[PDB]
Amino acid sequence: ALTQQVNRLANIASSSAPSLQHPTFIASKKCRAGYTYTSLDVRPTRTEKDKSFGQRLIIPVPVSEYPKKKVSCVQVRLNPSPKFNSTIWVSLRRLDETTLLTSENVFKLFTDGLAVLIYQHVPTGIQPNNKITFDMSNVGAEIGDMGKYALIVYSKDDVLEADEMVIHIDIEHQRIPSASTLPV
Amino acid sequence: TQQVNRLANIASSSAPSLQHPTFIASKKCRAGYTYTSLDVRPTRTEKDKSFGQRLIIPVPVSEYPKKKVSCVQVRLNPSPKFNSTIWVSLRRLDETTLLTSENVFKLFTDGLAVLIYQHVPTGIQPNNKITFDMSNVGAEIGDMGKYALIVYSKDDVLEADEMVIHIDIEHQRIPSASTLPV
Amino acid sequence: ALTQQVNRLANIASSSAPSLQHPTFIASKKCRAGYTYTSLDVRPTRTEKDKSFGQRLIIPVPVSEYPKKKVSCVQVRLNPSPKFNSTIWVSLRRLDETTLLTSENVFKLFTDGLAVLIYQHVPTGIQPNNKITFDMSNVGAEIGDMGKYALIVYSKDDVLEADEMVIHIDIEHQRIPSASTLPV
Amino acid sequence: TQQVNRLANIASSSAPSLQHPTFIASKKCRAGYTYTSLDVRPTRTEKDKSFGQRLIIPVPVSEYPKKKVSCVQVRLNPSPKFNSTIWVSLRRLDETTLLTSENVFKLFTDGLAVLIYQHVPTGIQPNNKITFDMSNVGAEIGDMGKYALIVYSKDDVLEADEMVIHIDIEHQRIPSASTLPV
Amino acid sequence: TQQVNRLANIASSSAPSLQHPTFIASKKCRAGYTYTSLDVRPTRTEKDKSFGQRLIIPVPVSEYPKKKVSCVQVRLNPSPKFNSTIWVSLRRLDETTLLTSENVFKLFTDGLAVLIYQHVPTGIQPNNKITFDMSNVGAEIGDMGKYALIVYSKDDVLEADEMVIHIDIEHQRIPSASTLPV
Amino acid sequence: NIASSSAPSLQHPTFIASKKCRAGYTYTSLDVRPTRTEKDKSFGQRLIIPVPVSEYPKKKVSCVQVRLNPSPKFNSTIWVSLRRLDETTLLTSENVFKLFTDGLAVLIYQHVPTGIQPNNKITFDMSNVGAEIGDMGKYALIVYSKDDVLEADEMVIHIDIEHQRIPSASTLPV
Amino acid sequence: NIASSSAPSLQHPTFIASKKCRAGYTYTSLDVRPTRTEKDKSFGQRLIIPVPVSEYPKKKVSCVQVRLNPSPKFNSTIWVSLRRLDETTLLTSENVFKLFTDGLAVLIYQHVPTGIQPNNKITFDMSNVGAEIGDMGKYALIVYSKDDVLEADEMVIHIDIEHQRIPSASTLPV
Amino acid sequence: ALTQQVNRLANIASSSAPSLQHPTFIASKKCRAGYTYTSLDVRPTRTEKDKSFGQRLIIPVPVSEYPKKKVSCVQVRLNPSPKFNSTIWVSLRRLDETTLLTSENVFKLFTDGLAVLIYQHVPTGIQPNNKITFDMSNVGAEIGDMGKYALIVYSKDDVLEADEMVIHIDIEHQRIPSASTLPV
Amino acid sequence: NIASSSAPSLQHPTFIASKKCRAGYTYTSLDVRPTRTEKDKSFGQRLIIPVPVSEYPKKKVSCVQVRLNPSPKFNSTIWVSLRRLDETTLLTSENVFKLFTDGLAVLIYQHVPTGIQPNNKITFDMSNVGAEIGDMGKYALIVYSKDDVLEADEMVIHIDIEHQRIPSASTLPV
Numbered sequence A, C, H: 001a002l003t004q005q006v007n008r009l010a011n012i013a014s015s016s017a018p019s020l021q022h023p024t025f026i027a028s029k030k031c032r033a034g035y036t037y038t039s040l041d042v043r044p045t046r047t048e049k050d051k052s053f054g055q056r057l058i059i060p061v062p063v064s065e066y067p068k069k070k071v072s073c074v075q076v077r078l079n080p081s082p083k084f085n086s087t088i089w090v091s092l093r094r095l096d097e098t099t100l101l102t103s104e105n106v107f108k109l110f111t112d113g114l115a116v117l118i119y120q121h122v123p124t125g126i127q128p129n130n131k132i133t134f135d136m137s138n139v140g141a142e143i144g145d146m147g148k149y150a151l152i153v154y155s156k157d158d159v160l161e162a163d164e165m166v167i168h169i170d171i172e173h174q175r176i177p178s179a180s181t182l183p184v
Numbered sequence B, D, E: 001t002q003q004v005n006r007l008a009n010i011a012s013s014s015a016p017s018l019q020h021p022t023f024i025a026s027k028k029c030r031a032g033y034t035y036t037s038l039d040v041r042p043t044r045t046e047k048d049k050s051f052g053q054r055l056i057i058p059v060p061v062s063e064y065p066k067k068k069v070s071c072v073q074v075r076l077n078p079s080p081k082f083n084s085t086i087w088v089s090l091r092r093l094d095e096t097t098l099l100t101s102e103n104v105f106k107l108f109t110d111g112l113a114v115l116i117y118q119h120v121p122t123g124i125q126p127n128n129k130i131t132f133d134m135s136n137v138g139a140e141i142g143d144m145g146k147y148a149l150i151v152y153s154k155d156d157v158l159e160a161d162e163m164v165i166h167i168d169i170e171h172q173r174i175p176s177a178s179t180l181p182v
Numbered sequence F, G, I: 001n002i003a004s005s006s007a008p009s010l011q012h013p014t015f016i017a018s019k020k021c022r023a024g025y026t027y028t029s030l031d032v033r034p035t036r037t038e039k040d041k042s043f044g045q046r047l048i049i050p051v052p053v054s055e056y057p058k059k060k061v062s063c064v065q066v067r068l069n070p071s072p073k074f075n076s077t078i079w080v081s082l083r084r085l086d087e088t089t090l091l092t093s094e095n096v097f098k099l100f101t102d103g104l105a106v107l108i109y110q111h112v113p114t115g116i117q118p119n120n121k122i123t124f125d126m127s128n129v130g131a132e133i134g135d136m137g138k139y140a141l142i143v144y145s146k147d148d149v150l151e152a153d154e155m156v157i158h159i160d161i162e163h164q165r166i167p168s169a170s171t172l173p174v
Ligand SMILES: [Mg+2]
Pocket: none
């Protein structure tokens, strides 16, 4: 028997179905299994129209303690509030504080070799495809590295409000060491 | 030959069936399990105002609290007067925590599933059901009370007659208890 | 060969040695392995002399979500501050808020079927045996159950200050389910 | 079992992937080949006016002209200010031949591929890429200069910041040349 | 027969050896690894005041930052003038975070090892060493700088001549680099 | 045939010769017009890895040669080298010397009427220090005009970087 | 015997030594008296392949050395090299420097009272750029008289061209 | 049978016992056997308080004649007189007369990579551990070399007197050639 | 494969090249700022073995190179070398010459406007004299400022010492 096409057909048939148990929120999978991940909360600030907002990657206190911990991918789901009226562009890349997101600056990178997600408010429910992910399997990303990165957003039409939405960014990486013996 | 059957199952979910107006499919989550539905006529709820109801198990089940729950579906048969469009979900609760609009959003927007039901003109919204799993969390019948369903009328001042919700509860069959009462 | 005494002799020889790498802090092991634990921080309040202080068990936000999660034991290490001048009695049991630690009330239980740790400040370094543990393997303790419990302390001589010390209470329990697939 | 894999490949191209906003797939045309992209900020171009750029290979490749080219993709990342709608393509050229609107159409309309990019409101146009093959024609790196990309702003007076194009070039890997310069 | 040898090892650690005044044993944490010590004459530090020093790797090692560290022992040879009694340890740092007495305690008291050295009259305190492991955390030579050793003079106004500390660093041997400089 | 395999080697006393460290490695050059930096005044530039590589800070670097093609106008005589560091350290004449006179490399290029002029190439090894692409930024080349104040046009330097070939770039872009 | 086969190699620090790229290859020289080109003024000549070769523009070129026998009168000091291009580009002093200071070769030949004078030979490789005989025309050598204005008689250059042997010339002509 | 632990357990049990036949004088063994040793007498001088006394290694007339004779270790037993009232620090290292034991100088070395013995007068008999030894197996020490070395002492509290004590320093080294034929 | 084993060797006429004696050997460098020693006046420094090595005077030494990184200010021209001796002997100009002109080594480093400057490195062999670490002290390097009086800042010397790797340093300290 040849099972190298069955899987493909099965998974392609799936992912593309408005089955049961779920809002207008797309699907999601997992990177190099044998990995665990960590999510992050990011309520934006009332960012003007044509204005861009961004946040650096600020690892959490318990993981941040293991830089050199490899990252595979990094998904970004965004649960919007009912008050999400605007429509915006969003993505994320490496840095050096040195650079500032002058509207002009942002476009620059937005437009070139790299991924970017658009989230528009549709009055026919709400834009399904609400998450996007990035792969570090190759660039080679250690946990410390994260800080260098940072996600962005650009409010194309409405002056997005802080109450308009909240983003969760999930991070696939190697399991951190599990202690099997009580403290000092 | 498990790949092929898997595709046959998926194709079935995706095809208008001769038993629904627009109400999408709804497979159950357990064998050897029975369920129990609930009726929920929501109080007329203002625009931007939210309505919620605790999980008040009924009289005959409420008595075997040690029984576990797998999942809990929420089908919502709307009345023709259903004009508004709303967001709905449910989670663990602490009474105190109040359904203040602001509070609501808070949770709505984070790790957890939520259903939106809009009144469309070309027939009516399909997926009118949504399910939640308690397997992992480990949920006993008594536990239910802790949880509670919510609703947010995003537009029209949702009317009382605008709709009715049914909450289905998968759990362990209750002992046949073959022995007439008292 | 008979290896049912070797282990015992080896572990008894060990635990009782002022070897290397460690202050006047006793040792520690692990309960039903295949379990993970969780620690808790408890800076006390300036508790008078002859007065007792106590804290209920307030599980954390990520675990508290899985009551019905069995607990094996519960250790209580106490890293004291240099300013730890007093000497105190400490332990922990089940409850019902209904009861209040009237000095008198405390003694009552302190004295009967149950464990209790004394921590005195010695001027010959500091009291080694600084931790104590309790077993729930049998009483059967689920995570929800914890809240019912609560640790206590009684300042026998000095009016213990909040800066005098801080306690960490570690909890052996079953590993919580690990998600292997990114969010909504 | 080559028919089955063929359908699996086709099904894959046709399914939103978790790495694109609306930018359709884009398979490459060669192994043992590497490519090289180019950036093209088009000058603000009037309505009904057309803009074009010759193929100016870069400094480090431009030096191994004997290297052959397979195909050349043209992805175009538009800015949010991208409001216009335009037609674009490219072919062999004779400098003299001038991008006079009229001339343009002439070729546009005949044996050859062309891409149209319109600004839609429901998100944004998908297929933002298009590729051309030089295998047959036989195209050397030097040859590129001969060719040139074009654009026609059918509606808005296409702005400079309205967008940026990237031209990908599949060709033979360049000799590792393991030996530090001069 | 691994149990028996284990007891022989343990018994050895626990027996005055003919090479120490009162300085307890001190086994190393790695093979194929070499270490490097450091000298630390602490500035005279008030009573209740704390002193600290960052990990300033030296000139010849500081150059192979990619080299990993296993553990780091801290032996402290006190002078006869050593009269005070102090607490000492070390951890990751953020410069800013200041050795304000209060800050110190904060960490001292939590998940982490700390050594106390008191001046006794019947000879002198034994265990004068303590070690920390970086295996798990994953520590490169460069990383060291991040960390820093601390001290708290609990009693006497610890004098400069009161003592000297040596910090031993287990890490990967440096390449023989058999090839005279420049 | 380990003898035949190692055989590689070729060079002669002249200003025209240069090998390379490890095969399967590719390199990358850099351009550096200096500044009209004064006499006695030193000029320096950080390692600004370019746009397509700068994306795998984890890739390894073997060597890094620095050839310098001068302009016919180049007249001054200057010392030049490079090392790692923290932006914190500043190229004060005094600071410069400090390092210059260290157990670590350095070239001098002066123009004089004597047969031919010095090699313009010099190279540094990272095969041991262990240098990843990201690491480069930390390093930075320097120069000290011992005599005439060189002008931004008295010369142009090219810095070549041996390192691991970057991703096969398997399939077409975005 | 791959070791014996590769064995070939021989040269020493002096103005008398030169090998060759690939065997089975023959070469062709060229003569180039310059022009009384001014001081600061640059002189250049295109690659005028000769009459019998110029007929197989498809033949491959390996290297191209450029030895230059100067006259005893040669006094000036000059820079010299060569590259490809489009007739369009013009040897303005400024343009010259531009390339001179590129990731691509160059020699300087000055006359001074110091032991012996620089090598007059320099060579360039085409084994990779891939150069066909026709291609030559595109290239062209240059020179810049940094000092004294050299005269058309201050020197004569010979340019040797390694390439594939031309047709066996099997049978007698027309 | 496995006899690689028996010996260890036996010798560890021993050395740590107040058996029979011996004052409050610790024990002692032997270095590379097949070696003989040589002792030295060192009555100190009335060395002030906070003052340090030292003596170079002055090999004896019959051995001193065979420099290049390797030394393994060097023990230093110190039989104190009843009048030993003070308490002192003692050790020993290489030299070059050039250096002088300024109290300050002494500390310097005392505190660093190297052994050091403290001998205090206790009124509960007398400080058992009265000897210390140093190993040259590795540094490689020839008999001539000794002279370079020299032992020291620092009277921490009482102004040690010459009558307060006397030290014997024993030297393990290779047997010197034994003549088996009468003289000239 | 004794041929392949011996194969090791690589160097070219320039101020950038240095091998090493025997493997399994490690070395140790030393720093030596001189003194503002007069013109004609010689300066010297004994071999002050450092603190961690100085403890195995019985360890063997192979070679001992002496590279000298000068400061840009270095102007004087000087002779330099080193040998064993008894503190008794004193560096009087006359005494200096005596040895300088012996069957035993020596370098001269002057600064001049001529292409590049001499190698700064020189090395000495002990593989036969038999030198133990302790022995070093007996030796000592010297210098003679033939012209300008060099200043303690006109230069800094590094002396590298090939010798047997010291004790594996098996287990953690005291
Ligand atoms: Mg790393």
